[PDB]
Amino acid sequence: LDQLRQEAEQLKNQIRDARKACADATLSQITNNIDPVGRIQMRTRRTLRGHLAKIYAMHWGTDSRLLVSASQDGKLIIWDSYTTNKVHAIPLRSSWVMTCAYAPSGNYVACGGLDNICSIYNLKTREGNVRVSRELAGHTGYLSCCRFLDDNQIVTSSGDTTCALWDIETGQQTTTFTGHTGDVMSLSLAPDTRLFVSGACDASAKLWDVREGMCRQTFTGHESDINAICFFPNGNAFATGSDDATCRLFDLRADQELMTYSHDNIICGITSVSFSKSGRLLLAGYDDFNCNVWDALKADRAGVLAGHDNRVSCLGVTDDGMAVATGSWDSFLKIWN
Amino acid sequence: TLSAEDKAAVERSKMIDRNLREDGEKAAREVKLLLLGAGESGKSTIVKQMKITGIVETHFTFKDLHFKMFDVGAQRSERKKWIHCFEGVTAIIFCVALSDYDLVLAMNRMHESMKLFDSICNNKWFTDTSIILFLNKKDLFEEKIKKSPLTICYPEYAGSNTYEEAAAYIQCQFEDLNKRKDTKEIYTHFTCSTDTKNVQFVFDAVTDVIIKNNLKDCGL
Amino acid sequence: NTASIAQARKLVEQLKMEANIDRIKVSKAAADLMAYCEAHAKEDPLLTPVPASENPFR
Amino acid sequence: VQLVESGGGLVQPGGSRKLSCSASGFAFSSFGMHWVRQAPEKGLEWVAYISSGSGTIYYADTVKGRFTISRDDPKNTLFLQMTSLRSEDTAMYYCVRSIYYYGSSPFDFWGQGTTLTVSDIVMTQATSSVPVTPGESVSISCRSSKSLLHSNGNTYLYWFLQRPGQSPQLLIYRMSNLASGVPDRFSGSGSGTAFTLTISRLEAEDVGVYYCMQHLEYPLTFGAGTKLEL
Amino acid sequence: TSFSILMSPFVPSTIFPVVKWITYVGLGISIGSLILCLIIEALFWKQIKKSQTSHTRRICMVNIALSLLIADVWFIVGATVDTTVNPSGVCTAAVFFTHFFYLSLFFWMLMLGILLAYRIILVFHHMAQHLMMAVGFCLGYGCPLIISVITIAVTQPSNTYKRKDVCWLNWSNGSKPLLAFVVPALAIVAVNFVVVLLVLTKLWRPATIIRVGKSLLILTPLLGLTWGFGIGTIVDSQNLAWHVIFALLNAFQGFFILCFGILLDSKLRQLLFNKLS
Structure with missing residues (x-):
């Protein structure tokens, strides 16, 4: 007991020393000279109408044309961006749903929410509909985020200090993850489908391997609940949204927070962060009703998509970078370029 | 300047929108209520009788209206991350017991119940949403005050030691903490174990908030 | 007791996994991110809008 | 997935015919339908198209006015009714399924075909x-x-x-x-x-x-x- | 050319330098205000389908605004044409336009009043949106296309369809054309007064004073309460000077609707400030 406590204290001191050893110069002391994106006079091209309630999540498909978005009304829509056509409408089992997923091979989707369960639907059926193929249970607190690893593996996280990797084929948790202290709200899957980083409401982020189950890193630096997390498309960094009116960009190797986005006249929450395809725009939503676009390398200014009249909740980009879609509490979704 | 396939795609999209809007329009004629209270509050009796893990979605149909009573008591998380999802509910139903008027759980029950009622009242999402209150366990209270001096929990009252006097203090002290009588109002009521008033009071509060809604929809 | 020993062992395991990591400076991360953002900056429509003909959203 | 034709036979010129299609094993009320015919010893010939929502209909140049196509969703059936039969209509028929949305495959499954015995891009x-x-x-x-x-x-x-x-x-x-x-x-x-x-x-x-x-x-x-x- | 010639068969010469002038000034604001309403009303139509009440009410507002605009412009035509120059043509067209569009605005006010009464009395009942718009349009532009058409039909044969001095209806021991404007215009005032009284009982729970005061302001003009002033000048030849009160209170309804029915809604106010300001 005492020896274990001493070893833990020594390891914590080593971790603190490692964190301190890598805080000499940062992005704004290196990349602040990069050429500004200027004013993104970025205008609506289509208004996807149809939502009868708030929007909580959208996800872009792999063909850059087929889109998925879902509401706290109980609908999950597969929709066409080029011609503003709706391809599929999927009803859900419980409306308190706070995340969605879209399979990379193009055949499946997934959803999850407070009811603690993660559900998987199959698209390319020969009989002419979209049906549910799996229901995954075994978490105890609310389910907040889910990603697809392949056609047969799915990663979920919940409000329990628990994460899990799930074999879709059998329904059995291959390996589960424990070690937070507060509720876990999100995760963002690596481009290589081998890792995931999760944010939890203790100003905490944790990095995990899917095969084993062990955690390898924990980052701190915030002051309230961390609501939304995403991932840099090359697998070296990620960005989280905090409810103390700041956005952050951590690295999955630097073992600390890299940058913070904040301003004096901003005191509202961050409900989502996502990147564009090239990575030179960080699009972040707030409660001040604006879906601001940041120069993600300078944290300097904010091009503004002042189109909405309620809280922002989600936003994403396509795989070829053609369009961006923002979804906010006003029951509308906007396609922009 | 379209082929046949594009025209078929347009037809499919429009059909989807029609059915979607119909379903969404029918899904706005429901009544949504969230249940709250303290631990070991006796709220089980109210939940069973009143009728008006994850979430216990208790559904009821009463007076042609669909009451979704969300019991969220199975959750062990801060309410600050998952309560705002109900910001469209008409009502919060609150349950607290009279019996523990001087029973120290550590201090006593009534102080923390009042903390909960105050916390629900001034919660910024619930600015325009009404709070319906049940005080319960009144027969055991009328029996039990026969020995207690009543002044243990409230060492500033010196009223008559009968049932109605102490009950009037309990009800007024619960109704006291409203800071915003301009927009919302708190309704007080005590649990009628041999009556169905526990249903009618809640129904009337819901109806009144609905009329307020349809009236301030005209700009008044 | 048993609970304290279990908590200490869990802390030892977690802090040993976290301590033994190959780590890099934040400046290197910043430089890599800048280089990536520069390299792929030509096929990106939002940063440079398509000229109204190859853009299906105009 | 199963599609079956029905209702053929031998008919003299004049009168009327009605070929029906029974479908089973799939979601019938979300697809669009065609009828396609083939000569007794030669190539094929299109006849008619009906679509989802019962709003779009198209016919053939050689038959228009003699023909009428229809669908029934609750019972999962399809109908084509013809009048004033001629010798050029001796043929073998087929129902064909096809659904239109981004990335679907039209004409995916063919029926078996009924037989009817009757005595402009090129x-x-x-x-x-x-x-x-x-x-x-x-x-x-x-x-x-x-x-x-x-x-x-x-x-x-x-x-x-x-x-x-x-x-x-x-x-x-x-x-x-x-x-x-x-x-x-x-x-x-x-x-x-x-x-x-x-x-x-x-x-x-x-x-x-x-x-x-x-x-x-x-x-x-x-x-x-x-x-x-x- | 008072505004009271709509209501009064007679206007005293003793006050022509006043009662006429007021009228003109009022119209100058009214039209100049009303157009603005409709323009603003076009800008924010895309976020209004929040319920059936919002859409139905704001459709009724659109109709009231346009109907008042055209009625008042063509009345200005009817007053400003010389009766001794053009015996036919433009004079009779002006009279028609005034009658029809003036019936129209009162009928659309009645529509908004019945909307609010429906929402509060029968709380739980819902009909489809398209039936609502159909009934609304067929009654708002409905009976107006019956009275101003039938009125000419009987009136023209005797050439009683104009006054000698002003191209507007007159009556003298015979044809009674303003009894096809005065009687309708007032029979809706009674209903909307009842509507305000009905809402006030719900609003007064026992800022109880401030809520009731704001309610009285927001539903005094838009429901047609001010027109009742004219009940004093359509029953007496020259009482005292009620004419100036009628002109001052009724010739400025456009300013009333723009300041109250538009600038009082909080969300619309914020949206305007965000967009235009």
């Missing part, structure tokens, strides 16, 4: 017969009288295979893409009104008649046919 084939022996590769063509490449990036050529006693099988939908249930040794493609099909490493059951089709503007017209011979 597309033809290039050859008539090529003797074929197993172990060798084969290729077949067609030509059309007008472009099939629409504005929005498609090319509406459809390639089909028929074996003796069997129904057609969707070798190729939209002239470049392969259907489900068919071996990967098949392939098909086209050009500026010149079209082709290929079968590599010829096997048995790969000997039959091969058919081309267009879908750019109603009505739809076929060729006459190309056959390989063992």
